[PDB]
Amino acid sequence: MDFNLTEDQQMIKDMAAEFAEKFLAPTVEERDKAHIWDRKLIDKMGEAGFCGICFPEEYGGMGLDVLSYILAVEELSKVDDGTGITLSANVSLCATPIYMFGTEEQKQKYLAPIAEGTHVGAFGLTEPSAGTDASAQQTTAVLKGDKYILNGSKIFITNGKEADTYVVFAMTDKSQGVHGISAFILEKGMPGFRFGKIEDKMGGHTSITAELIFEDCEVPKENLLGKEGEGFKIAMETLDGGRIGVAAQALGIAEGALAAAVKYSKEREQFGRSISKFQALQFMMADMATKIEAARYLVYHAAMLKNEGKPYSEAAAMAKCFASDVAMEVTTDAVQIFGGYGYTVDYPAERYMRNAKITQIYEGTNQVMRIVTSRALLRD
Amino acid sequence: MDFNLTEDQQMIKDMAAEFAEKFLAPTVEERDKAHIWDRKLIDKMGEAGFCGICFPEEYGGMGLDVLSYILAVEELSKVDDGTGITLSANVSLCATPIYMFGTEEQKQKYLAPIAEGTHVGAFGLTEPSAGTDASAQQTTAVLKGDKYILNGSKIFITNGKEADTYVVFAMTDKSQGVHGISAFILEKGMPGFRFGKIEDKMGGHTSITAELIFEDCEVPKENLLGKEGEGFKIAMETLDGGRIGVAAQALGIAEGALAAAVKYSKEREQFGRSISKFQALQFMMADMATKIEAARYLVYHAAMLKNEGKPYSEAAAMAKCFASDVAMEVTTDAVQIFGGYGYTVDYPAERYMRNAKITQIYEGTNQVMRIVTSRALLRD
Amino acid sequence: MDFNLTEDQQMIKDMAAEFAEKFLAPTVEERDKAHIWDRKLIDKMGEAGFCGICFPEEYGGMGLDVLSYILAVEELSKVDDGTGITLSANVSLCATPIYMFGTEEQKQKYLAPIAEGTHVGAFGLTEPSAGTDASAQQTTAVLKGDKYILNGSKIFITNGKEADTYVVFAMTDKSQGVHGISAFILEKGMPGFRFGKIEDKMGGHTSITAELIFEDCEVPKENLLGKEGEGFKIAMETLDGGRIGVAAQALGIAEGALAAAVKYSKEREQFGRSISKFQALQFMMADMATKIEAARYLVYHAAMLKNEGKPYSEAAAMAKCFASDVAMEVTTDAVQIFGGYGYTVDYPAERYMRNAKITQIYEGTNQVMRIVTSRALLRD
Amino acid sequence: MDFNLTEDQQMIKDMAAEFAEKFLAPTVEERDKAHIWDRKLIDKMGEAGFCGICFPEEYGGMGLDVLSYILAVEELSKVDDGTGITLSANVSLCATPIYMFGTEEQKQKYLAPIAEGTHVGAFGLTEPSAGTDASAQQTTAVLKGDKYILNGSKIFITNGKEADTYVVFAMTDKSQGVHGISAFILEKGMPGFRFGKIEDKMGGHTSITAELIFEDCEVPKENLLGKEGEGFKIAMETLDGGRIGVAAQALGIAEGALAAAVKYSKEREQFGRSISKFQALQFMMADMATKIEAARYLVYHAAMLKNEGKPYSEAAAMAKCFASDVAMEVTTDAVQIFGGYGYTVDYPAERYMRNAKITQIYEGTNQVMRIVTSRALLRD
Numbered sequence A, B, C, D: 001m002d003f004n005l006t007e008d009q010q011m012i013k014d015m016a017a018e019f020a021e022k023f024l025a026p027t028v029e030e031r032d033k034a035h036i037w038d039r040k041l042i043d044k045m046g047e048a049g050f051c052g053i054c055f056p057e058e059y060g061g062m063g064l065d066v067l068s069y070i071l072a073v074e075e076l077s078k079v080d081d082g083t084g085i086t087l088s089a090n091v092s093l094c095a096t097p098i099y100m101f102g103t104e105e106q107k108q109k110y111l112a113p114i115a116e117g118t119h120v121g122a123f124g125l126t127e128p129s130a131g132t133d134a135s136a137q138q139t140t141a142v143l144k145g146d147k148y149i150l151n152g153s154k155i156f157i158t159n160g161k162e163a164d165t166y167v168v169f170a171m172t173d174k175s176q177g178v179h180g181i182s183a184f185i186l187e188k189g190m191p192g193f194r195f196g197k198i199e200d201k202m203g204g205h206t207s208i209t210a211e212l213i214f215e216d217c218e219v220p221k222e223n224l225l226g227k228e229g230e231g232f233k234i235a236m237e238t239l240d241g242g243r244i245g246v247a248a249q250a251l252g253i254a255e256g257a258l259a260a261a262v263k264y265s266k267e268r269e270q271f272g273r274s275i276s277k278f279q280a281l282q283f284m285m286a287d288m289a290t291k292i293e294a295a296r297y298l299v300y301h302a303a304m305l306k307n308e309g310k311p312y313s314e315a316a317a318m319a320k321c322f323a324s325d326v327a328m329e330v331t332t333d334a335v336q337i338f339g340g341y342g343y344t345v346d347y348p349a350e351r352y353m354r355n356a357k358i359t360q361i362y363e364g365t366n367q368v369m370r371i372v373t374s375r376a377l378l379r380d
Ligand SMILES: Cc1cc2nc3c(=O)[nH]c(=O)nc-3n(C[C@H](O)[C@H](O)[C@H](O)COP(=O)(O)OP(=O)(O)OC[C@H]3O[C@@H](n4cnc5c(N)ncnc54)[C@H](O)[C@@H]3O)c2cc1C
Pocket: A089, A123, A124, A125, A126, A128, A130, A131, A132, A133, A155, A156, A157, A158, A159, A201, A204, A209, A358, A361, A362, A363, A364, A365, A366, A367, A368, B268, B269, B270, B271, B275, B278, B280, B281, B336, B337, B338, B339, B340, B341, B343
């Protein structure tokens, strides 16, 4: 065992902290208040290399490991976890399945520009009737000549509308149920592909979330990803990695919130002393700091297993569930530490608390995480 | 012991439910989104008699009991807790200290118009340096002829700016510390009394919260409330009752959130069944329901103690602490039960959760509540 | 609403506190250490009237209400909850179903001596294969002439072996499943009725818990309780009341533990001050005191509904679940407040903690309580 | 970062598991019930090499690393945590301060026999008036010729009476307070060194805990450990490592309890299915498993920091606080999963739960852990 970062991991973490400080921090308050997803900023992140950390240089990336990428999502999320989830949807939800399942032709066409920073990616699985029950897909894809024709819709898609490239799931054979689903690579601008509602959320205001609509959408036949009927496996494998990303986002949001409260507590005086001198607040901040350290190693262990080519599905679900629960509890108390000031948008705590709640829900709810963990635990 | 409501209590509960259904529920979503405090709606509430429930008929009230009033606060808060806290601040924070410490002339002039529903009230204690440490007042009042001249400011005042009548605290003799504070009745429009920042908050969007500014503000000598030096006592007694109101608010919020979640869980299907058929969700909802019932009796007991003329400070601190913690836990799980939908403003859950958080902070934070409770526990 | 005890309720509470102080407190430590269930003490309780509080004078009781009885279980349980559960099994689990379902002849024969204090009662439902799944009864009863012949066994029976009178459940018609069970009144000393294992438990050392064994046990036909096939309804109705008893036991154990820790904390000094001066311990004791008050009114509301002849099954399950969870959490922290001393049998905290855990399990586990509450919540 | 065990670590883990299976598991139930600390079994442990794992070969040890030792403590504690804490006190509390502050002659005389497995060690800091306030030492040591003469006593000493070698703390200059404390190596059999009460505890029945009494106890001058006045530093450094041992103990306890509960849940049927098929129990077990994994990495990180010669006091306090809270929550739910059976000594759950509680108190209570953590968090 070795708990030390590698030189590459540390370098990536430092690069991310520098990016966040220069490009995210000065504007996050304003962008949050105004609900802005700023594509020029997102482009600057992509140009700085973040989307290609963990992909081979032969596909436009840096050739580094999973944990370096996870560190960057965490570090960005300390400051602007809306940008953090933007990066994670790009890498874990879109690029990864193209990397894992795509032909060489698809990897060069679609993965490389995401890794290089040019293209934003999204993952279209969730439908009105298929959320947790993700296999209950009603979007259809029917092969007609040299095209699949897609009909349906997806909802709540991170980077939706603005993404260039989508990995979408549709039924090619309803009678084969979970074995009837296939994955497709779509481009923004394809015939019959349009966007619907942009969601107005509790939080995540610097992340864009949109409906996708397919009305006889024409998808070239070669943009089938993997084999017909492999789509569920692709979705589940992708989500196993994306849960590590969300875990990292939650970790960063928790760390951001605690760092803010610590600093406030040392500055704010009541009863002629800093509030950090009251033992109940000391103990609350001790518990916050402890839960965060405990979450951190779950997230890191999952990343490492993935990098080592070992099973990581259970580890990822554990990390996701624990980190997101931590973020919710930490951020709730960080608002408390600020007092009345914490309930106002002029201070940073309320943004962290609002943004924490979604970590418990997306990429699979924490109820799903517990299903995954208990299945693994209770297997013969 | 008798857990049944009196006829008067049940009638007021019903009138509140009917008012909330007709006047609050149709517009609360749009008012929250737009951050609207609608004076004409508040006026309809006053005209219906809500602000006079627990005041004698000789002061324009209905002559009923404290719990009846508490039940109305709770009922309104099931639907629109910004309106609930507006009521509670009118009644518990402004009207009540005038009723309890005012001369007959001050009650006729200032209490009756609140009880009759034409005037909105507010309570100005908190300062930038005096939050939890409420006795650290820097606002001064200096008697000059037939006026006290006030200088200072107050922050985070519920119903501030909009309110017509204010009970405000200022140092008349700083060298006497906690014994040098006095209370004054202010009117909107007094020279030198203006309003500052209107806070932009995480929630409570249908409640108004404002800074008060006093710049040689001229207050009639006869608007001293109680004796000089009695102000801190007036503040603390007022807050004891105010805590019951906040508790009732939190209780309504939790109940509104649970009821939304129950209903949704019966209607929403995944895996071929209503989500209410999954045991983990059943248990979460059982726990929500149970916590709410436990909180309810704490709130009603505090209200009954106050109505019986018994000590209720500790009871009110317990109820407030408990019910606000329950509201926070319940609303956070109610969002969870709605899944992704829950994180969107088109469903009701996110508003309850945002609104719950402030119940843990205002009218004394839950740390203060635990100081008050522990001091009573540990006394002698 | 009225939260005041009646004069009778207060009198009963005072009688119970006096009994506990005189007869339980001086010996509970010794009886716990030695695992003694002292029948002479149990007889003194019965002679003092506790078993007959809530039964009509025409059946040997005092003619008072359910809550008076529940207060006595609570008060006894502050001091010796082993004796508390002994009383509760006597009254709620044995006497009550004879009262509710018995013929006049059975009430005079079997209820009256329990109400009068002469006879100890027990309730025999649980089998090795039927715990939570209580309908899965394998003990059989077959009518042969003027006797039912019983074969099987029960496990974990409170007051087993030492009880005089048992209400036992057996299948009279396995093919009718839950509608095939019947209830029988047994006497200690009946042919073919013997006792097996006396359990060695984590706690509850002043309560006796035994196996019952039936080997062609001959039960007079008139000792059928209710009608053939009504046995499950009798069991469930009985347990609805017994859960209020357990709730009361848990409440008392919580109160006992907190009272002990409060007193210790005011006496024990470290760092030149009483440990009650450290804000983290103040807040822990505030939370304990708050949770106990919240539990109390759930328990009392359930008792009151039962007394008023209203549905009380959901209320009882709520009270049981919440009070027992409270007792577990409170007692765990009360041991913490004592420090090292708390881990030793010379101080009282460790007995309260060990005895709290069973409250979450018997009379139906808290998982069952949540099933009952969520069914009630989610019903159409 | 590397989450894999080294070959040495895995070998020690395996040797510990094999030792526990062959020597502890067959008798732990009977030893716990009888409150047996079996010196000959402790001697077998020493002979196997467990007490020397992390000491140099020149002092009779194996020459391996801190985590290897920690892994052995954890593994033993899965089965018999009384034996685990016996080991930890031998190693972390007695052997280590001799290793870290002893002269070469004191290490050969006193360290090597522990590392070789023939001598048992103990650490005598706590006094009746000096628990959490450890610097408030009343035991005195007065140099008289070639002896220090010791007067006082110690309470709650793990391995006391049985131990052969003791590191004990006494005031050599009371007017220097925390700087007037010195450390001494004592042997069982020194004139004036006797033993007092052997504690009767809630749990830890296979660990011995005793009072030490010094009545003009004669200690060779050369048995001063470190310089005069350095004692408190020696104590605090020793406790930092000791906290890792307790953390590892708690971790083993939780793991042993979860594994028992998992296995049982797969075997026990109610309602026609294994209880592991009910979702609420699945989620409870997922949560147990997740908390244990989160705690594990805190413990291993603390151990690695110590092995790397880095600061580890805060890491060890976090690990201890977290793992002991996890053990308490896990063991309490493991009892729950066994139902009524769980409350009986014939099943393993109740012993784990009783034993978990002391991990929250000894080697510094979890309140101390939060002081240490908060002080490091809030530093500057
Ligand atoms: C901001 C945001 C971004 C999103 N991003 C994406 C995206 O980029 N791509 C994508 O495809 N999807 C996306 N989603 C959709 C998201 O993954 C789903 O919301 C989530 O899977 C839950 O589905 P649902 O909302 O339909 O809730 P439902 O599945 O209806 O769940 C409702 C509740 O029931 C519980 N539940 C359901 N089934 C069970 C069960 N068997 N046992 C126990 N409890 C159960 C759930 O846990 C939840 O608490 C996003 C959602 C949001 C809010």
